[PDB]
Amino acid sequence: LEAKKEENLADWYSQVITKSEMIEYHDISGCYILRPWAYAIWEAIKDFFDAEIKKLGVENCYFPMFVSQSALEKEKTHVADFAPEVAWVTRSGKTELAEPIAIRPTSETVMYPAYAKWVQSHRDLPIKLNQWCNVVRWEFKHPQPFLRTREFLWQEGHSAFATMEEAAEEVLQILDLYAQVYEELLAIPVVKGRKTEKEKFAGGDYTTTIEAFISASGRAIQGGTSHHLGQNFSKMFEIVFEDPKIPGEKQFAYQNSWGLTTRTIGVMTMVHGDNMGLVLPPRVACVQVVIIPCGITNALSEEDKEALIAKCNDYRRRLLSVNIRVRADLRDNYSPGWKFNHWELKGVPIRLEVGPRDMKSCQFVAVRRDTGEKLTVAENEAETKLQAILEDIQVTLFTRASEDLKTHMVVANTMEDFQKILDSGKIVQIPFCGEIDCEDWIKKTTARMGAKSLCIPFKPLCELQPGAKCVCGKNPAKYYTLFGRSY
Amino acid sequence: GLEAKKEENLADWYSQVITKSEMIEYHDISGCYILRPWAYAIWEAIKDFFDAEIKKLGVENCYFPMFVSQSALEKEKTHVADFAPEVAWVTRSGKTELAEPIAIRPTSETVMYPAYAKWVQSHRDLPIKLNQWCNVVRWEFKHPQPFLRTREFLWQEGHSAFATMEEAAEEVLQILDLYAQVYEELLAIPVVKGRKTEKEKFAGGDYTTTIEAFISASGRAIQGGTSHHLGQNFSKMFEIVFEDPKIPGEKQFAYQNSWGLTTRTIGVMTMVHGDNMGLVLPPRVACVQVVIIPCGITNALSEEDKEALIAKCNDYRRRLLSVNIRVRADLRDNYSPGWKFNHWELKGVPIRLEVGPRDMKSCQFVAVRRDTGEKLTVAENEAETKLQAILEDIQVTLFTRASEDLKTHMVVANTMEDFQKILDSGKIVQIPFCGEIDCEDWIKKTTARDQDLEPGAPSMGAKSLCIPFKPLCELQPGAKCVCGKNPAKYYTLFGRSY
Ligand SMILES: NC(=O)c1nccnc1NCc1ccccc1C(F)(F)F
Numbered sequence: 001l002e003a004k005k006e007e008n009l010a011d012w013y014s015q016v017i018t019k020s021e022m023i024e025y026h027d028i029s030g031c032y033i034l035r036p037w038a039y040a041i042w043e044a045i046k047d048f049f050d051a052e053i054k055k056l057g058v059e060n061c062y063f064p065m066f067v068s069q070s071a072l073e074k075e076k077t078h079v080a081d082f083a084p085e086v087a088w089v090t091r092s093g094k095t096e097l098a099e100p101i102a103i104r105p106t107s108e109t110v111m112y113p114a115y116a117k118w119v120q121s122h123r124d125l126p127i128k129l130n131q132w133c134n135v136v137r138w139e140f141k142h143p144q145p146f147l148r149t150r151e152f153l154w155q156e157g158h159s160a161f162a163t164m165e166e167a168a169e170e171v172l173q174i175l176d177l178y179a180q181v182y183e184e185l186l187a188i189p190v191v192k193g194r195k196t197e198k199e200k201f202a203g204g205d206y207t208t209t210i211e212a213f214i215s216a217s218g219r220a221i222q223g224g225t226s227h228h229l230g231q232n233f234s235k236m237f238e239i240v241f242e243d244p245k246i247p248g249e250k251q252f253a254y255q256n257s258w259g260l261t262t263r264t265i266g267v268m269t270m271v272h273g274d275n276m277g278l279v280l281p282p283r284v285a286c287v288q289v290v291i292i293p294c295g296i297t298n299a300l301s302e303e304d305k306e307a308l309i310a311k312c313n314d315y316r317r318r319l320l321s322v323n324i325r326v327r328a329d330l331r332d333n334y335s336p337g338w339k340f341n342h343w344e345l346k347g348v349p350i351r352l353e354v355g356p357r358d359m360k361s362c363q364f365v366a367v368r369r370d371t372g373e374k375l376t377v378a379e380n381e382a383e384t385k386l387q388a389i390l391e392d393i394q395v396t397l398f399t400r401a402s403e404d405l406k407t408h409m410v411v412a413n414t415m416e417d418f419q420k421i422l423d424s425g426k427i428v429q430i431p432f433c434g435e436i437d438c439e440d441w442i443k444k445t446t447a448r449m450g451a452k453s454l455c456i457p458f459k460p461l462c463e464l465q466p467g468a469k470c471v472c473g474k475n476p477a478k479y480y481t482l483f484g485r486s487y
Numbered sequence: 488g489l490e491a492k493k494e495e496n497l498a499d500w501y502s503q504v505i506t507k508s509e510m511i512e513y514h515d516i517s518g519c520y521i522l523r524p525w526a527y528a529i530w531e532a533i534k535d536f537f538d539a540e541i542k543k544l545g546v547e548n549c550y551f552p553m554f555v556s557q558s559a560l561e562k563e564k565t566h567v568a569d570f571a572p573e574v575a576w577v578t579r580s581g582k583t584e585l586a587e588p589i590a591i592r593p594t595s596e597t598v599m600y601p602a603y604a605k606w607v608q609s610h611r612d613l614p615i616k617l618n619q620w621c622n623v624v625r626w627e628f629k630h631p632q633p634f635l636r637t638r639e640f641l642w643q644e645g646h647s648a649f650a651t652m653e654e655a656a657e658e659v660l661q662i663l664d665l666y667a668q669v670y671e672e673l674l675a676i677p678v679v680k681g682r683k684t685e686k687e688k689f690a691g692g693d694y695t696t697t698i699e700a701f702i703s704a705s706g707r708a709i710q711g712g713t714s715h716h717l718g719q720n721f722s723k724m725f726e727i728v729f730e731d732p733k734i735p736g737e738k739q740f741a742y743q744n745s746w747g748l749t750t751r752t753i754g755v756m757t758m759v760h761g762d763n764m765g766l767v768l769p770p771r772v773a774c775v776q777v778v779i780i781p782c783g784i785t786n787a788l789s790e791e792d793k794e795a796l797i798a799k800c801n802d803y804r805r806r807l808l809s810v811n812i813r814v815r816a817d818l819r820d821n822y823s824p825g826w827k828f829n830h831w832e833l834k835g836v837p838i839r840l841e842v843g844p845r846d847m848k849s850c851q852f853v854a855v856r857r858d859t860g861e862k863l864t865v866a867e868n869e870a871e872t873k874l875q876a877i878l879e880d881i882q883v884t885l886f887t888r889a890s891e892d893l894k895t896h897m898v899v900a901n902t903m904e905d906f907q908k909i910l911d912s913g914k915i916v917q918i919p920f921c922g923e924i925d926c927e928d929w930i931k932k933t934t935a936r937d938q939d940l941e942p943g944a945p946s947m948g949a950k951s952l953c954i955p956f957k958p959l960c961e962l963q964p965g966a967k968c969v970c971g972k973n974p975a976k977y978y979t980l981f982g983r984s985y
Pocket residue numbers: 137139146147148149150151152222223224225259260261262263
């Protein structure tokens with residue numbers, strides 16, 4: 001590893017995603033190859049989240065990638081924001097299509113015409129569908145792997161309900177599942193809140209979100225979104241059902257949509273990665289333990305070399321029995337010192353070393369990836385203390401990252417102390433009037449980069465006392481709003 | 488119920504089964520179809536089995552970009568020349584025209600192999616075994632048909648690079664065997680292992696192996712899977728090179744393979760086992776293996792007793808889950824039991840379980856097989872054992888009827904007219920073939936020329952399907968092809984296909 005996180009963050013980031021064998025670059029700007037090491041993280045996320053939403057009655061499906069032009073322009077506010085970043089197909093080989101078709105940036109306009117066909121009676125609701133797929137948002141801002149790419153993987157869940165109390169319940173339920181993905185899996189603390197009128201999803205009523213903080217850059221980044229579309233889409237796609245009471249009074253469904261992307265993997269790297277490679281939380285770590293034989297010299301006993309090789313295979317059989325994910329690295333054309341840095345750069349939480357002097361003494365060495373501690377453990381307590389170190393790494397990664405979040409999430413009441421603490425690489429919660437105009441004025445003023453609205457926190461730090469005005473002086477403060485430079 | 492009959496009009500029957508089973512919803516873009524949860528669950532079942540198997544082989548999952556530059560796509564000359572007119576091109580983002588059009592992957596050889604070249608610096612980096620589950624686009628000239636032939640479809644593509652041709656060739660047959668297990672052991676569909684002729688092989692590879700399946704209602708075969716040996720045609724173009732320690736200083740090119748399987752699998756399953764009552768799911772891939780419906784709930788039964796009948800249904804549900812049987816308990820109060828029976832018959836659930844009030848105190852229940860309609864009354868105590876035996880027998884007899892259907896419809900002919908007569912009877916034929924491409928086109932036109940079909944069946948000529956690894960009869964020495972102008976090389980399976 002070359003660069004350092006505190007110095008050049010961008011070059012440290014490009015070095016660790018490639019040398020951990022997560023990312024490979026592509027001759028199309030904004031598109032990055034997910035190599036198996038990275039994809040396994042997305043699979044661990046997918047296995048967790050797929051299991052949790054199917055308890056809620058959501059089923060998996062797959063809708064088409066191509067959107068017709070008529071369907072795209074069905075609702076005018078949704079198509080207004082997404083119009084510039086829609087990639088259009090106009091040709092099949094050398095023959096031009098009669099009408100251009102669009103690659104989905106999101107599937108609201110693809111799925112809901114089918115929702116209208118499937119909802120004939122009251123008994124056809126609720127409809128709860130989810131798909132794992134790729135999406136294209138052609139962003140001409142500078143792309144960055146995982147965090148902001150031209151094409152990314154995600155899940156998008158779309159639900160339709162007869163009542164508003166139903167949709168309101170699911171919006172918060174999905175958001176809590178997104179927080180578990182970041183906190184219980186990726187060991188990343190998040191802030192749950194509500195988007196402002198300026199940053200809310202175009203075509204919905206309100207947008208709940210979770211925000212994460214990247215200390216190395218001082219910038220915040222959105223982790224997940226759970227939108228309440230209300231009736232905005234069902235009115236344009238005619239997802240109707242008869243009212244059980246008044247016959248002939250149409251009722252529009254209440255809808256939600258929610259999405260989680262592979263940016264999770266980038267935020268994992270930017271938060272936990274250090275200057276000696278990736279750091280994987282054990283909950284999503286593809287390989288939790290790697291066993292590496294040590295001390296094998298050219299003149300070593302070939303009979304004992306078989307015995308030392310056998311002892312490494314004895315540890316993996318035991319750790320597999322305790323459902324600890326472990327791979328034994330016995331490749332005979334790589335030095336034991338090369339395997340050290342290889343799995344270090346990859347982020348494996350625990351390295352297990354086996355040497356002749358330790359094998360004969362019924363002992364082995366455990367090397368934690370996060371802190372670098374080396375501990376000699378007897379051969380009997382392998383299934384216990386290694387398991388204990390794994391969740392200790394999980395909690396050490398989380399408490400140290402929450403302590404970073406608590407230090408950099410402070411309160412400010414006027415734009416004097418707001419501009420000061422913002423330029424120190426921290427995010428602040430300021431009294432906000434909620435107007436889309438004052439929101440742009442802050443971002444224009446705080447650049448003299450800028451700071452956007454992140455979320456209106458469900459639980460802010462300080463209780464807004466009556467009489468406190470905004471930072472604009474012309475309007476009262478409606479709520480404390482978390483602000484900061486964002487990705 | 489179902490209106491169209493599979494034996495009369497197959498197209499309407501297919502369109503009705505895939506919709507009334509809630510598998511397919513249509514879209515406003517031609518050739519693209521919505522995979523509803525009932526169909527998608529099948530694909531996740533195929534995905535779970537095939538993924539566990541290729542990982543035994545050392546293959547790992549990943550995801551490459553769907554966009555291809557024009558230069559990378561055109562590196563292998565004969566590869567792009569075959570796919571060029573069916574590649575979708577992105578030419579503008581919003582209202583802003585792109586300086587250089589980019590392409591949507593019809594397959595990922597040209598996307599991945601620039602990275603393979605970068606990853607292969609020495610012989611220690613080989614082999615490379617990568618696979619991905621993703622979507623591709625093929626804007627084909629043919630008539631689209633849900634599952635079987637769509638403009639966008641879901642699939643898996645595995646791409647492996649080896650240092651020697653022996654290592655690659657072994658993988659080709661290993662994977663083809665897995666595809667055959669997917670069809671024969673999961674979908675209960677018999678298949679024929681063989682290799683494509685020179686005309687039908689993958690453009691850019693050395694040879695193509697394939698599993699061909701047969702659809703008796705249409706008399707047409709369909710390709711279920713391919714496992715290509717690309718040889719070195721791509722590594723010579725993409726510079727996937729290494730230095731063998733035995734041959735000093737000389738550039739060695741990697742031997743590569745690529746293999747694919749698509750969501751066509753679901754349409755073949757539909758076409759083979761479906762009947763005039765709807766879909767028929769093989770129990771190994773059924774989203775729901777057993778559905779439990781409470782019957783006999785009259786308006787005279789008290790709320791206390793009605794809660795006791797639903798509690799017994801849930802008890803049957805919990806017992807079947809403990810023995811790893813995928814079970815749904817349809818306890819909906821807004822649908823009558825008669826609608827529930829037709830609902831789960833159209834969707835193909837292998838076993839319907841009926842629990843009534845008189846049956847509850849009698850300590851018995853009813854099981855109804857979807858494949859035959861046979862009703863059996865089983866004792867409450869022997870439920871976990873009997874139902875598992877029924878599910879297993881359903882899977883066997885589905886495959887057993889399909890295998891006998893294949894046996895009777897796959898015969899051998901040695902003259903051009905006897906091949907013709909058997910071809911127009913709704914069968915596929917193994918004939919002695921000279922192998923050359925120009926003779927296969929002759930067969931394609933001549934069989935379509937001298938075709939005697941029923942009033943309504945359109946003109947369709949026979950094409951190559953595969954050169955079977957184990958043909959029906961040994962080719963006689965000196966035996967000549969069905970054209971009579973060239974010596975025959977092997978028995979080739981011919982017939983009309985999708
Ligand atoms: N080009 C991009 O914006 C992007 N690129 C790569 C990965 N994620 C991206 N967006 C984030 C996103 C998009 C859609 C729904 C939720 C989220 C969330 F992560 F913020 F929650």
